[PDB]
Amino acid sequence: PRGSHMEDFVRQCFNPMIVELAEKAMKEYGEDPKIETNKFAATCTHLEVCFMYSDGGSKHRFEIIEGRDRIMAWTVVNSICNTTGVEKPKFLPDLYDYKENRFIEIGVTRREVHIYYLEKANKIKSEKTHIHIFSFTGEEMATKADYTLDEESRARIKTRLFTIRQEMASRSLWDSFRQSE
Amino acid sequence: PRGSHMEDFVRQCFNPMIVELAEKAMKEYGEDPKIETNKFAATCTHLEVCFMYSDGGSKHRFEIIEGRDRIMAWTVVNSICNTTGVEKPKFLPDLYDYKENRFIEIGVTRREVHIYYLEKANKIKSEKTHIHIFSFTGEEMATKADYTLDEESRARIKTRLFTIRQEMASRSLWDSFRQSE
Amino acid sequence: PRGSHMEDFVRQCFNPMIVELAEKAMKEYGEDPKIETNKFAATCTHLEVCFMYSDGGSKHRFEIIEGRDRIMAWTVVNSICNTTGVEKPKFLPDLYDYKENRFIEIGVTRREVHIYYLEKANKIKSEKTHIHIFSFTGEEMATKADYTLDEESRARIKTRLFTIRQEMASRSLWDSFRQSE
Amino acid sequence: PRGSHMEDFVRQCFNPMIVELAEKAMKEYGEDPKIETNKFAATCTHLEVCFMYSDGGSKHRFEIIEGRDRIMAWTVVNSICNTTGVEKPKFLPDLYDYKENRFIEIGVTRREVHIYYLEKANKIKSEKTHIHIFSFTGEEMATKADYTLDEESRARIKTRLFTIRQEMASRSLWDSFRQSE
Amino acid sequence: PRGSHMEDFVRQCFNPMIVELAEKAMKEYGEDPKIETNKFAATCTHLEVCFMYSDGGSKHRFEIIEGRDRIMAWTVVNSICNTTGVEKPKFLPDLYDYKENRFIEIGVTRREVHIYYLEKANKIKSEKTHIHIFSFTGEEMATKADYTLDEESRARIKTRLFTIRQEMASRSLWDSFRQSE
Amino acid sequence: PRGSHMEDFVRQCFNPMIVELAEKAMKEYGEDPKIETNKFAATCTHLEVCFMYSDGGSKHRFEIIEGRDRIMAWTVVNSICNTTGVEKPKFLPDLYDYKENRFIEIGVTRREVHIYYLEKANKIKSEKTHIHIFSFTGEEMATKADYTLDEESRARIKTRLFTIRQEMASRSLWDSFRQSE
Amino acid sequence: PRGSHMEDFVRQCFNPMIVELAEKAMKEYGEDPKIETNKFAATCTHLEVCFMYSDGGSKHRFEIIEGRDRIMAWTVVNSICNTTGVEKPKFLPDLYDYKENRFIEIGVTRREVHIYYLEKANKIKSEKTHIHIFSFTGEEMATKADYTLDEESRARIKTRLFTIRQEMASRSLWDSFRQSE
Amino acid sequence: PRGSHMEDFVRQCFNPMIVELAEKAMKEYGEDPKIETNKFAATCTHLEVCFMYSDGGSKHRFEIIEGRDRIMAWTVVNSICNTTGVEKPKFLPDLYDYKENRFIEIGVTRREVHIYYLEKANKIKSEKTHIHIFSFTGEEMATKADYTLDEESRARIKTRLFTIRQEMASRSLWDSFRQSE
Ligand SMILES: O=C1c2c(O)c(=O)ccn2N([C@@H]2c3ccccc3SCc3c2ccc(F)c3F)[C@@H]2COCCN12
Ligand SMILES: O=C1c2c(O)c(=O)ccn2N([C@@H]2c3ccccc3SCc3c2ccc(F)c3F)[C@@H]2COCCN12
Ligand SMILES: O=C1c2c(O)c(=O)ccn2N([C@@H]2c3ccccc3SCc3c2ccc(F)c3F)[C@@H]2COCCN12
Ligand SMILES: O=C1c2c(O)c(=O)ccn2N([C@@H]2c3ccccc3SCc3c2ccc(F)c3F)[C@@H]2COCCN12
Ligand SMILES: O=C1c2c(O)c(=O)ccn2N([C@@H]2c3ccccc3SCc3c2ccc(F)c3F)[C@@H]2COCCN12
Ligand SMILES: O=C1c2c(O)c(=O)ccn2N([C@@H]2c3ccccc3SCc3c2ccc(F)c3F)[C@@H]2COCCN12
Ligand SMILES: O=C1c2c(O)c(=O)ccn2N([C@@H]2c3ccccc3SCc3c2ccc(F)c3F)[C@@H]2COCCN12
Ligand SMILES: O=C1c2c(O)c(=O)ccn2N([C@@H]2c3ccccc3SCc3c2ccc(F)c3F)[C@@H]2COCCN12
Ligand SMILES: [Mn+2]
Ligand SMILES: [Mn+2]
Ligand SMILES: [Mn+2]
Ligand SMILES: [Mn+2]
Ligand SMILES: [Mn+2]
Ligand SMILES: [Mn+2]
Ligand SMILES: [Mn+2]
Ligand SMILES: [Mn+2]
Ligand SMILES: [Mn+2]
Ligand SMILES: [Mn+2]
Ligand SMILES: [Mn+2]
Ligand SMILES: [Mn+2]
Ligand SMILES: [Mn+2]
Ligand SMILES: [Mn+2]
Ligand SMILES: [Mn+2]
Ligand SMILES: [Mn+2]
């Protein structure tokens, strides 16, 4: 047994569906949520942001790729590629935008948004995949200064992120989380 | 007992409400889902596309004729005809469009959309009934190049169709399904 | 016991919430649904039309007065009058339109819409109350040729009304219902 | 035991979620709903108005601060301030408007709206916090004559307030409630 | 409007299903729950006791006659009589005991149980109908000193009755209720 | 369209799960509930009696064979036979009794129970299958005078049957139902 | 903000209904669950044990006094006393046993059961109130060596208590909890 | 992708809760349900049998150890051992019997029950752990000829097992499943 304070916080911070999907994702890659508790908190956070993000558009606008098992995520990507003609990305994206006709990679970072976007931009070769970074201090950075959603939908995310930061802080979990990325 | 791999795939591929409605439809016409398993898969697919399609418009836009028992489908058609003045079609359509004021026949084909539309166009005498064909490779073809719904709503359908194709393929069921139309 | 075929049809034709509200309305006025079965069918129909009607606008557009007990319906009317300055009507209306700022009296008739509107127009003294008649043959007639809702929302109602007519007919209940108004 | 007629009216007037949230709020400040029954009725009313108010905008428009425990309300305020740059208010507001980028203090008064707005305006130092007063007679008063929501959304609130007034009156509870502010 | 304190207490004292069934019962006999508020409280109480009583036996032991519309209550009585050979009672009973093979009339009184049993015993001619009286002070009296249920099941009822008495008292409603029988 | 009064009565008499299972059973054998309305009423009745019957024993006592598709009913029979050693019956039974270790054929008749039991006894060759007949007048007849369940569980069934008889009668449907067996 | 590891553990250890009832109980006595976190854990534990305990008897055996607001707990006690003749206890008990006709005070201790029973026995003057102590190491001690429930029902409680002990230990919360009584 | 016919059968054969728990169990041990499809079918079967088994006793009789994550299963075992004094087993058991005070290891085999019991008996050192083997042909074998449950509860399991065998057979999956143990 590990008995982590972070694990208990994550289960009280996030809704059960988010917790369960992150748990399953971590296991698919051979990570244990009871040990890699910072990663447990990060994947739950990233998932909520993706779900909040997809809720921001018009109905039917987004295809959610994140939150699926590896095989099924790539299946939906293939159907999207084979029906829209977009090139198949080399790395799994997070969403697909049926309005702008491009995949979206979403990032959540405890560092400056500019340095995380650099990393993801270099990692992904598919220059077509749109990148959108959010930070725990309320900054965001998006490819071509195109932020996809309107201001209010993005502001919700930023507010939620800062609330998770505080909840972590009041429990003395933030410092360990911050210096873990 | 038949014990079909396709039957089990259909029950895991489609949601129970779709499965049940297709089962009932097939029986109304004296077909057994446990034997005519390709038809089982086709009617479930066609139904989902119709439901996805009707979800694409503004609220109240569409009347769903598909997914009802024969007698009740013709009842709703009669009320539609007797209240809008449109001519009564000779063959049951799939939807009615209260915005464009016309019935819609929806088709899903494993062949080239152009050859399936030809068949349906000649079968139906009511030239007023709007035709919309979708293919399992992402093509679509609609009467008068009028596609009724906006791009994103149609792209969802095309993506879903290609996902069913893949799911069938990974189980070695696609070839039998394709060469069955 | 009465054991009416119409009573059983009404309970299978309408959803339980509509049936229950009409039953309660009829009793409040000292009418028995098991005897006055035509009135049972009429009040259920009128209620569904009112609910369909109120679903036709933008969110928050309509206040539903029908489907409440007498005392509470007049309470909501008073609050509406005392907050919008509109004159208090002499007879209970069916809805209030927050967009057009007027009460709506809704009518459903088995006769020509023009003769039913005449009756309601003369009955109500409050010339401000907007009148909207629907018929079982798909006609409608509204004060000042102002039909409040857009075409599709009204077409749904007309289709539903003609479907109830048919359902009644196939059971040989229509003739008795028609020649009862 | 107190056995208040007002307490029983409040539990039949408001929905359980509203009652429960007000009960919890009152206790957090060391007030007993079974004794301070006018305050019980007021906080339930204020809460419903806030929830009705937040339902009036576009989706994602408002952040609801009211209806949370003290510590969590200030947490969401901090995240809002730390992500939008708005100054942190000295007193807890009721909502945040992501469209207009300002906090909203909502007031419900049994006096003239003009005298209650004066009080709240002087109490709060943060001149940025938008003030919106509703009265039990259907008047409203908002900072800069900017009423945030469109007419119909505000008219619903005014109607609901006058309905609570009547419900109180028919039980001879209004006079005590009015002369308690 | 009547605006009764008793009416509001009844809706907070009893569960909605009990309230609704009593309301419907009272209307079937041309009584208004908003005026005859003592009768409103009495019929709700009597109903709860009957339901508690029927929950006291083994599964399938009791047929609940109370809580049905007049016509259906007499229908179930007829089926019981026509299948068990028991004589048809002249007045509607409250339950039927499939173990002891007899109808049960249940009484709840604010007077001495002995004087209420006398009344019911003389009212009913069918000496076969078993009588069981409960009082608001915890006394009970049953035909032939046969109390049907075991002690604990009857003690629950007595406890619940005294709790309703107290709830009424703390609101100064008991005296009016007591001196109303 | 047929528009039967019996069809509407059946849908108001029986619970939706019973109606649906009977509908499906009738179709599996190529019968239409909208035409063979007496058979519709009979199969619903028989099903309810079987479900009531299986609810009469101790938990786990009965295996319900009725209410399944043909293929699955015979599957459960085979597992029962292949695990208890009982001989496989030639005709589908209604239940299996794990306490008495025998299949049960349940019958509901509008004639004298003695003449219906004769028919079923001669039809079935498996003398091991226990027979239990119920009548619409409250009589019952069981193999070897062994009635499996205790008195109260059987009395419920008899009461329910006579209630269906009355409900049919008050609608002038009984005579046609009776003279149809 | 306090941000306690114990608080988060309690919300993941106990079911929401238990957490909520304990939170409300603590506030009624002017204790904050966010600060007095050991008491938060203790009251949740005690509540679960009481609910498990009451689930151990026959149906209707126990009246649950714990888990109610102070005023209502004493109301049910009064009805119990005024209907069974038992003397009214000076301190709120946890249950009432309708079979043995006595109140039960339940205790959960981190010390030797014998020393906690001594304390409760001296605190309560009503020698009639039955005492039942459980320990976190699986010991129990009951008045007159009468343990009310059968062995299996008590063993469940003991197992659950030791599981909470372990869950606390694996998080390094046990030592602080133990040395807090 | 694997696309197994067995995988699809398992998801249609077992209820979602059973499927999900087995999936999670298999992953905890580094097995993939999409590849080890026979093991997928076996663990689902074993789980259902355990749940059926635990449903066979009196309420509170059994503690279910199977169907939990490794760490929590051993936690409940420790609490059971530390509260009943039973020796801690070396290998995780399936249940604990509070009536007979012993752990139960449940086995399901496609071979002769006698050879599987031999294996489990030698594997486990704790001679105290009670062993109960079920076969897919309806045989069972239990330690000391003590079968814990009464006949009917065990017969249900045997019937269910043979039904899974048939369902597998009709799909030509049985032979591969049988020759896999
Ligand atoms: O989708 C992602 C993913 C992102 O989309 C992302 O933005 C950042 C990081 N990711 N990774 C996520 C992840 C997601 C969110 C926060 C941290 C991590 S850290 C690695 C990891 C992930 C999932 C499970 C797991 F066990 C991991 F170790 C992996 C990269 O491989 C494709 C899926 N994926
Ligand atoms: O509505 C349709 C229908 C279509 O709308 C359609 O587009 C293609 C094909 N259809 N047919 C559907 C159907 C639907 C979808 C896929 C395949 C089939 S193949 C024949 C068949 C259908 C339904 C039940 C059944 F038993 C059948 F044999 C029948 C044609 O008679 C009117 C209803 N209908
Ligand atoms: O609101 C209506 C109402 C209408 O709004 C309406 O359009 C036509 C007719 N109405 N009446 C409805 C009614 C509604 C729909 C169809 C038929 C009837 S017929 C009389 C009656 C009604 C309700 C209960 C009852 F027992 C009745 F006898 C009464 C007129 O008194 C105010 C309420 N009300
Ligand atoms: O948010 C409010 C609040 C308002 O927003 C408001 O508009 C008027 C009045 N308020 N107060 C509310 C309140 C809200 C609605 C109606 C009356 C009261 S009267 C004092 C009181 C409140 C909450 C609990 C409690 F026990 C109280 F005594 C307190 C002021 O401290 C911050 C929270 N709050
Ligand atoms: O069943 C009862 C009934 C009893 O069973 C009973 O015990 C006492 C009294 N009853 N009556 C109940 C009733 C039940 C409980 C408490 C008070 C009353 S007072 C009259 C009344 C009743 C129902 C509706 C109504 F409008 C009434 F005026 C009527 C007597 O006519 C048959 C039904 N019924
Ligand atoms: O199980 C029964 C069955 C009985 O168990 C029974 O007792 C009487 C009669 N049965 N039959 C039932 C049935 C059941 C209840 C009332 C009438 C009927 S009449 C024929 C029929 C049945 C089912 C569907 C259908 F379309 C039918 F025409 C058929 C006999 O073939 C095996 C299944 N079955
Ligand atoms: O019922 C109990 C109670 C017990 O029944 C008990 O066994 C031990 C202790 N109790 N007390 C419980 C309690 C219950 C369980 C564990 C610790 C505590 S510690 C004090 C406290 C309690 C409740 C709220 C609160 F804020 C408290 F400070 C109070 C004693 O006043 C009557 C109610 N009550
Ligand atoms: O509990 C069991 C278990 C049994 O109880 C059992 O009876 C037979 C076999 N078991 N094993 C089960 C299992 C259960 C049912 C059918 C086959 C298997 S095969 C190995 C395996 C199991 C679980 C997950 C997994 F990935 C596995 F490879 C493992 C042995 O390690 C402790 C848990 N466990
Ligand atoms: Mn991703
Ligand atoms: Mn990402
Ligand atoms: Mn069609
Ligand atoms: Mn089509
Ligand atoms: Mn009206
Ligand atoms: Mn009208
Ligand atoms: Mn506020
Ligand atoms: Mn405010
Ligand atoms: Mn009665
Ligand atoms: Mn009575
Ligand atoms: Mn049968
Ligand atoms: Mn039969
Ligand atoms: Mn206590
Ligand atoms: Mn205690
Ligand atoms: Mn195991
Ligand atoms: Mn095992």
In order, the DSSP letters of H27-60 are: HHTT--TTT-HHHHHHHHHHHHHHHHHHTTSSTT
**Ion ligand 9, residue ranges at CB < 5 A:** A 66, 94
Question: Which regions of chain F does DSSP assign to beta strands (E)?
Answer: 62-64, 95-97, 102-109, 130-135, 140-142
**How many Å apart are CA C133 and CA C113, to the nearest integer?**
6
Q: Are the C-beta atoms of residues G21 and G15 closer than 8 Å to each other?
A: no
Cα–Cα distance measured from residue A113 to residue A38, given in angstroms and rounded to the nearest whole number:
19
Any binding-site annotation on A31? no
Residue closest by Cα to atom 31 of ligand 2: B92
Across the interface, of F60, F79, F84, the residue whose CB is closest to H163 is F79
User: H/E element holding F155?
Assistant: helix F151-170
Query: In sequence order, what are the beta bridge partners of E102?
Result: E97
In SS3 terms, chain A reads as CCCCHHHHHHHHHCCHHHHHHHHHHHHHCCCCCCCCHHHHHHHHHHHHHHHHHHCCCCCCCEEECCCCCHHHHHHHHHHHHHHHCCCCCCCCCCEEECCCCEEEEEEEECCCHHHHHHHHHHHCCCCCCEEEEEECCCCEEEHHHCCCCCHHHHHHHHHHHHHHHHHHHHCCCHHHHHCCC
User: Radius of gyration over alpha carbons of chain D, in Å?
Assistant: 16
d(CA G171, CA G173): 5
SS3 of residue F85 by DSSP: coil
- Check if H120 is active-site: yes
Resolved by: X-ray
Alpha-carbon distance B47 to nearest alpha carbon in chain A (angstroms): 18
Do residues D18 and D49 touch, judged by C-beta distance below 8 A?
no
B83–C162 C-beta distance less than 8 A: yes
Rounded CA-CA distance B83/B63 in Å is 13
- SS3 labels along chain G: CCCCHHHHHHHHHCCHHHHHHHHHHHHHCCCCCCCCHHHHHHHHHHHHHHHHHHCCCCCCCEEECCCCCHHHHHHHHHHHHHHHCCCCCCCCCCEEECCCCEEEEEEEECCCHHHHHHHHHHHCCCCCCEEEEEECCCCEEEHHHCCCCCHHHHHHHHHHHHHHHHHHHHCCCHHHHHCCC
Task: List all chains that touch chain F, counting a touch as 3 or more CB pairs closer than 8 Å.
Answer: B, C, E, H
The DSSP string of B61-117 is: -EEE-TTS-HHHHHHHHHHHHHHH-PPPPSS--SEEETTTTEEEEEEEESS-HHHHH
Decide whether any atom of ligand 7 lies within 6 Å of the G43 Cβ. Answer: yes
Rounded to 10 degrees, the C-alpha dihedral D113/D117/D120/D126 comes to: 150
Token digits of residue E141: 């009296």
| Helix, coil or strand: residue H141 | strand
Query: Which residue in G13, G6, G51 sits closest to G32, CA to CA?
Result: G6
Identify which of E23, E36, E40, E46 to mutate to test ligand 5's pocket (most ligand atoms within 8 A of the CB).
E46
Closest C-alpha to C26, from E1, E24, F13, E22: E24
Q: Are H181 and H39 in contact (CB under 8 A)?
A: no
Residue listed under structure tokens 């093509």? B139
Contact status, residue C81 vs residue C128, Cβ threshold 8 Å: no
CB-based contact D79 A160, cutoff 8 Å? yes
C-alpha E179/C-alpha E126 separation (Å) is: 30
Determine the Cα–Cα distance for residues A155 and A161; give it in Å rounded to an integer.
10
Residues of chain D neighbouring E171 (CB-CB closer than 8 A): 3-5, 8
Residue B130 labeled ligand binder: no
Q: Is D36 in the pocket of ligand 4 (CB under 6 A)?
A: no
Helix or strand (DSSP H, E) at B54: helix B37-54
Q: Two tokens at B41? A: 């898969």
Which residues lie closer than 8 Å to H142 by C-beta, 6 or more apart? H130, H131, H132, H133, H148
Judge: G71–D1 Cβ closer than 8 Å, yes or no. yes
Chain G residues bordering chain D (beta-carbon distance below 8 Å):
1, 27, 34, 71, 75
Which of E43, E65, E113, E157 has the most ligand 5 atoms within 8 A of CB, as the residue to mutate?
A: E43
Check if the beta carbon of residue H86 is closer than 8 Å to that of residue H101: yes
Q: How far is C-alpha E23 from the geometric centre of its chain's CA atoms?
A: 14
Task: Phi first, then psi: give them for residue A107, nearest 5 degrees.
Answer: -130, 140
User: Dihedrals φ, ψ of C124, to 5°?
Assistant: -75, 130
Q: Sign of the CA dihedral F111, F113, F118, F122?
A: positive
- Ligand 4: does its nearest atom lie under 6 Å from the Cβ of D142? no
Residue span of the structural domain in which E100 resides: 1-181
Dmax of chain H from CA atoms? 49
* Catalytic residue status for D66: yes
**How many whole angstroms separate alpha carbon C157 and alpha carbon A174?**
58
H15, H32 in Cβ contact below 8 A? no
Residue of H78, H30, H57, H56 whose CA lies nearest to H65: H78
Determine the Cα–Cα distance for residues E175 and H161; give it in Å rounded to an integer.
66
In the annotation, is F88 catalytic? no
Q: Which chain A residues have a beta carbon less than 8 Å from that of G37?
A: none
Instruction: State the Cα–Cα distance between residues D137 and A8, nearest whole angstrom.
Output: 49
Distance CA(D133)–CA(D118), nearest Å, equals: 10
CB contact at 8 A, G91 and G124 = yes
The answer to whether the CB atoms of F1 and B27 lie below 8 A apart is no
Q: For residues E108 and E161, is the Cβ–Cβ distance under 8 A?
A: yes
What is the rounded CA–CA span in Å between residue A154 and residue A147?
8
Q: Shortest CA distance to F54 belongs to which of D27, A156, A176, E60?
A: E60
Neighbours of G78 (CB within 10 A): 16
Please report, to the nearest 10 degrees, the dihedral formed by the alpha carbons of residues G149, G154, G156, G157 taken in order.
120
Sheet holding B130-135, edge to edge: B62-64, B95-97, B102-109, B130-135, B140-142
Helix (H) or strand (E) holding D81: helix D70-84
Q: In what order do the strands lie in the sheet with G62-64?
A: G62-64, G95-97, G102-109, G130-135, G140-142
State the DSSP code for F91: S
Torsion of CA H141, H145, H146, H152, to 10 degrees: 60
Contacts 24+ apart (CB under 8 A), B143-149: B146/B100, B148/B56, B148/B57, B148/B97, B148/B100, B148/B104, B149/B53, B149/B56, B149/B57
Cβ atoms within 10 A of the Cβ of B61, count?
19
* Nearest atom in ligand 5 to E39's CA: 17
Structure tokens at G16: 């929401």
Paired sense of beta strands B102-109 and B95-97, if any: antiparallel
What is the distance between the alpha carbons of residues H150 and F59, in angstroms, rounded to a whole number? 12
* Cα F131 to the center of its chain, rounded Å: 11
Which of C77, A113, H29, C70 shows the shortest CA–CA distance to D83?
A113
Contact D8 E4 (CB under 8 A): no
Helix (H) or strand (E) holding F10: helix F5-13
CB H91 within 8 A of CB H124: yes
Q: What is the CA radius of gyration of chain B?
A: 16
Please, is G105 exposed, middle or buried when counting C-beta atoms within 10 Å of its C-beta (0-12, 13-18, 19+)? buried
Chain E residue nearest residue D4, CA to CA:
E171
Asked if residue H95 lies in contact with residue H50, where contact means CB atoms within 8 angstroms, the answer is yes
Q: Ligand 7 test: best mutation among G10, G27, G38, G46, most atoms within 8 Å of CB? A: G46
How far, in Å, CA of E47 to CA of E67, rounded?
Answer: 7
Measured CA to CA, the distance from residue C59 to residue E155 in angstroms comes to 52
**Per-state percent for chain H, helix, strand, coil, to nearest 5:** 50, 15, 35
Cα angle value B92/B93/B99 (rounded, 5°):
145
Resolution in A: 2.2
Q: Among candidates D83, D82, D136, D134, which has minimal Cα distance to D104? A: D134
C-alpha distances out from residue E161 to B70, D14, E164, Å: 57, 27, 5
Contact C1 F170 (CB under 8 A): yes
- Looking at the DSSP bridge assignments, the partners of residue E103 are E96
B145 neighbors B41 (Cβ within 8 angstroms): no
H51/H38 Cα distance (integer angstroms): 20
- The domain total for chain D is 1
The conformational region for residue D138 under phi > 0 = left, psi -120 to 50 = alpha, else beta, is left
Left (φ > 0), alpha (ψ -120 to 50) or beta: where does H106 sit? beta
